[PDB]
Amino acid sequence: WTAGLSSFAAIPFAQSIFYRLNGVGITQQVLSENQKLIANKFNQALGAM
Amino acid sequence: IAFNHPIQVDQLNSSYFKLSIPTNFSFGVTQEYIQTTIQKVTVDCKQYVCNGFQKCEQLLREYGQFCSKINQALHGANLRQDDSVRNLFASVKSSQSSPIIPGFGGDFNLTLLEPVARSAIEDLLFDKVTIADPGYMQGYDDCMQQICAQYVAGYKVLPPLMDVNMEAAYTSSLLGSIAGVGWTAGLSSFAAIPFAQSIFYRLNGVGITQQVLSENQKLIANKFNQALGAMQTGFTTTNEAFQKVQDAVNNNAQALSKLASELSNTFGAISASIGDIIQRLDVLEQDAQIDRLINGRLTTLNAFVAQQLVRSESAALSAQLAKDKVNECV
Amino acid sequence: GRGVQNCTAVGVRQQRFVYDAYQNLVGYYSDDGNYYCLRACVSVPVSVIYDKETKTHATLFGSVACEHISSTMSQYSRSTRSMLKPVGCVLGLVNSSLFVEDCKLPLGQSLCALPDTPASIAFNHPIQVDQLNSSYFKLSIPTNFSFGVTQEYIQTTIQKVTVDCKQYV
Amino acid sequence: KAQSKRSGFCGQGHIVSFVVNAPNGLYFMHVGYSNHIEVVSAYGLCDAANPTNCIAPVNGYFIKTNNTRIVDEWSYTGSSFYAPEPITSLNTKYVA
Amino acid sequence: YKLQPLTFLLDFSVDGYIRRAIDCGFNDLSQLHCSYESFDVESGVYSVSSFEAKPSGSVVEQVECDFSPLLSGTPPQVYNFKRLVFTNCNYNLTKLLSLFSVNDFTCSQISPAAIASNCYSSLILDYFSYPLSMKSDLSVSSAGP
Amino acid sequence: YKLQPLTFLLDFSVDGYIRRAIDCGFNDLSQLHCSYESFDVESGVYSVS
Numbered sequence A: 001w002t003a004g005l006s007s008f009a010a011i012p013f014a015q016s017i018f019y020r021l022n023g024v025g026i027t028q029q030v031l032s033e034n035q036k037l038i039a040n041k042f043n044q045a046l047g048a049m
Numbered sequence B: 001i002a003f004n005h006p007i008q009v010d011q012l013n014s015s016y017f018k019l020s021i022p023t024n025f026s027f028g029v030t031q032e033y034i035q036t037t038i039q040k041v042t043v044d045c046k047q048y049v050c051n052g053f054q055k056c057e058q059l060l061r062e063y064g065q066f067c068s069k070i071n072q073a074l075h076g077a078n079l080r081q082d083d084s085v086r087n088l089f090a091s092v093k094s095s096q097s098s099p100i101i102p103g104f105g106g107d108f109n110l111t112l113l114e115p116v117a118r119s120a121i122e123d124l125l126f127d128k129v130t131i132a133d134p135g136y137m138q139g140y141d142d143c144m145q146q147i148c149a150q151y152v153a154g155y156k157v158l159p160p161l162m163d164v165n166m167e168a169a170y171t172s173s174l175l176g177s178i179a180g181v182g183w184t185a186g187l188s189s190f191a192a193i194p195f196a197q198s199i200f201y202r203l204n205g206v207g208i209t210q211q212v213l214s215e216n217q218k219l220i221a222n223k224f225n226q227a228l229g230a231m232q233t234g235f236t237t238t239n240e241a242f243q244k245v246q247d248a249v250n251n252n253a254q255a256l257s258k259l260a261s262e263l264s265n266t267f268g269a270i271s272a273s274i275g276d277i278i279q280r281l282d283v284l285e286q287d288a289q290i291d292r293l294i295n296g297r298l299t300t301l302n303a304f305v306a307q308q309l310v311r312s313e314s315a316a317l318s319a320q321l322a323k324d325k326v327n328e329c330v
Numbered sequence C: 001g002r003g004v005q006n007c008t009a010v011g012v013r014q015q016r017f018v019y020d021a022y023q024n025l026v027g028y029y030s031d032d033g034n035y036y037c038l039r040a041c042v043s044v045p046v047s048v049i050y051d052k053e054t055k056t057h058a059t060l061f062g063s064v065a066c067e068h069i070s071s072t073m074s075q076y077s078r079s080t081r082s083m084l085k086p087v088g089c090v091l092g093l094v095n096s097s098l099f100v101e102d103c104k105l106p107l108g109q110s111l112c113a114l115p116d117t118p119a120s121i122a123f124n125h126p127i128q129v130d131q132l133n134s135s136y137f138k139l140s141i142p143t144n145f146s147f148g149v150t151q152e153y154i155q156t157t158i159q160k161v162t163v164d165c166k167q168y169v
Numbered sequence D: 001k002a003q004s005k006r007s008g009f010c011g012q013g014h015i016v017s018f019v020v021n022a023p024n025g026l027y028f029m030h031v032g033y034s035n036h037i038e039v040v041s042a043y044g045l046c047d048a049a050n051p052t053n054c055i056a057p058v059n060g061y062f063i064k065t066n067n068t069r070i071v072d073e074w075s076y077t078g079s080s081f082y083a084p085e086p087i088t089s090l091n092t093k094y095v096a
Numbered sequence E: 001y002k003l004q005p006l007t008f009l010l011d012f013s014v015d016g017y018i019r020r021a022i023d024c025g026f027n028d029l030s031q032l033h034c035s036y037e038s039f040d041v042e043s044g045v046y047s048v049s050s051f052e053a054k055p056s057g058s059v060v061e062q063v064e065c066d067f068s069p070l071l072s073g074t075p076p077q078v079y080n081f082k083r084l085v086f087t088n089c090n091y092n093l094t095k096l097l098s099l100f101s102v103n104d105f106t107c108s109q110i111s112p113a114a115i116a117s118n119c120y121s122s123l124i125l126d127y128f129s130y131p132l133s134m135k136s137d138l139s140v141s142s143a144g145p
Numbered sequence F: 001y002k003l004q005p006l007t008f009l010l011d012f013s014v015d016g017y018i019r020r021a022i023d024c025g026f027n028d029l030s031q032l033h034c035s036y037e038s039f040d041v042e043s044g045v046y047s048v049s
Helices: A012-024 A031-035 A037-047 B054-061 B064-093 B120-128 B141-145 B147-150 B164-181 B200-205 B209-233 B240-263 B283-327 E028-036 E093-100 E112-117 F030-039
Strands: B041-042 B156-158 C043-051 C057-062 C134-143 D021-023 D025-030 D034-040 E009-012 E016-021 E044-051 E084-089 E122-127 F008-012 F018-024
Touching: A012 A031, B054 B064, B054 B283, B064 B164, B064 B283, B064 E016, B064 E028, B120 E112, B141 B147, B141 E093, B147 B156, B147 C043, B240 B283, B283 F018, C043 E028, C057 E016, E028 E044, E093 E112, F008 F030, F018 F030
Parallel strands: none
Antiparallel strands: B041 B156, C043 C057, C043 E044, C134 D034, D021 D025, E009 E016, E084 E122, F008 F018
16 A cells, blocks of 8 residues: 555565455455455456457 | 666565665655646737728728637637636635734745735746736837837737736635645634644655654754755756746747737738838739738738637646646645 | 837948848938937727626727827827727726726626726635634534535537538539 | 545535536536634643543544534534544643 | 718618618727627627827938939940949939930839839939830840840 | 858847858758857757758
């Protein structure tokens, strides 16, 4: 969360996507764990583009 | 090589991550100009054309309808600019203000109190820029003693429609408003209003400071006032933002003057300003040369009107962007 | 040419005529051997303030001396048009009924300089909330909801039209 | 879509927004929120106990702890809020 | 009442007879109505033709150069064209016109009355013998030999 | 020195006598000086014939 400046530096890309998804939508980290091949579905979406 | 290399950080496999901590507040920065409006100019048809000669004016009557349309278009562009200016100043009707204090900041040598009427910072910007477009019983009088706008009759400058001192008073009210509007309290509250400090609310928003650090920030605030003084000294042409303000002033003045020189000058070599003015005593010979000259003057005037309409439309979009910045940043 | 003096010495002096990066000439040495600079012919700008409701027209002169201008001036061939139609020079001479008649009127004539002209002067009437020097707050709460405000048109799109070339001509 | 009230591009006042059809375009009906009464308020208080009076929303107010209304109507909230206080500022007995 | 050429917008009724008209020149309002081409114009601030100064006291600065060589001696042939350069000298073109009847007078991009009225920086007068019949052959611009 | 038709940038002093002249034909920099009607031109990359 870069609230002020670049002091926050860097965070793991995969973890950042999960946290941002949790904030944007009701999908939660526990729900994401229940969901299977979520990353594979994201890869399929990139392939479709 | 022009490459400057952005600062870099190292990704860590462990959940704990390296962080970068600032040590200098470095408060104060120079900022861009939104342009906002263009100078308003009205061209008097039947005076620049024919150089106030009745015989040419009789020929001009055939083209009189086109000249009237040109005047209406210029009036419409100026009216659009006036509507944009009033909308921009509407944001100053908010019910938030702070009574002005000569000692606005206890340790702040601020350039915002008017000397006693155009706060020093506005005065400094006005002093460096030079505009010859507006004259009121001064430049016109000086030319007689020896601007030329009235004497050439090519164009007449139109005043901004807002007093600069009245607008400066509105900016002083905005200086009071910034601290009050920028507060946790909803709607309008004066709040602490300590020289725009906004207590610690502004400080916490800009960076997540500690209360002990806030006392250090008060010492840093004296340094910030010195940094603001350095920004005031840096009003040189080298700064791009100041150069942009100068370019806009130069652009409005250059556009009317360059087109006015085309409208009144040698024009066609045979035309010589007025066709056969002294070359031919006969009215018919003078009229034929004049008719060709008049058409050329009208076409250049049409190009000037089209350019002004484009500039006014761009100014209206720029003014809306300036209003947007007042809505969010201010 | 029509032009209006005594000026500082300029030019080689071998040629009486002098120019200033323009076809127009500053002349000089017109009679004998003395500098005689030439100035562009004097022109006085005039504008008309008209109100449709009251059918009233006021002649306005901008950036010109009040004393220099006069009703039906002999020096100028036309004062304004074929026929004509003295307030202090805030912007210039205005020949209008009464004087400034300053009043607390916000606007409505949009005069070139600033007069409301319902030559009345506009009043900012700013709203200010007092702030104590000692740390304090001055919350301001509206008495009534005053819900509802008029909104401007956003344009959105323009009409689509096409012309068949060679058939229209 | 939603109430803004921050950097509002609505009608210079924002509560509710509506959309109406216009010829060759679109039209809007934004709602905005009369004369404002100013009340003098002390800038915070420090209690002897660790929790202290603090300004978080409109807050502020003077004696008797918090006597403020977030809504334009007065006395919208009796004084409920409480919560822990992170730190105490200078001029103790008051956040002032 | 005398009549002079004027531009008037004329109102025509259902009958088509003219019941209303505007001079368009006498008053600023009439000029404004003619511009918009409407009897009623919305209230606004409108510019009108500005006042101009009146011309008076034209200043002309005045030694009469002799024209005797031009009218005396043998005129050389058209190929041997002969001209006399005149600078800083007063001129009497009227005397020359009276002295010789002029079979044809033509001026290119200039007028004879205009030249007499205005001073010229330099004047060249040319005298030479050429056939009167071949007027077309000799010209400022011609295909004549 | 043989006279030839030649575009020239001319500077006239208060006396009115020319003290500074530039030949547009000779030198790329001199041609650039004739452009902008300025004896001194701000540093820039400019196309030449």
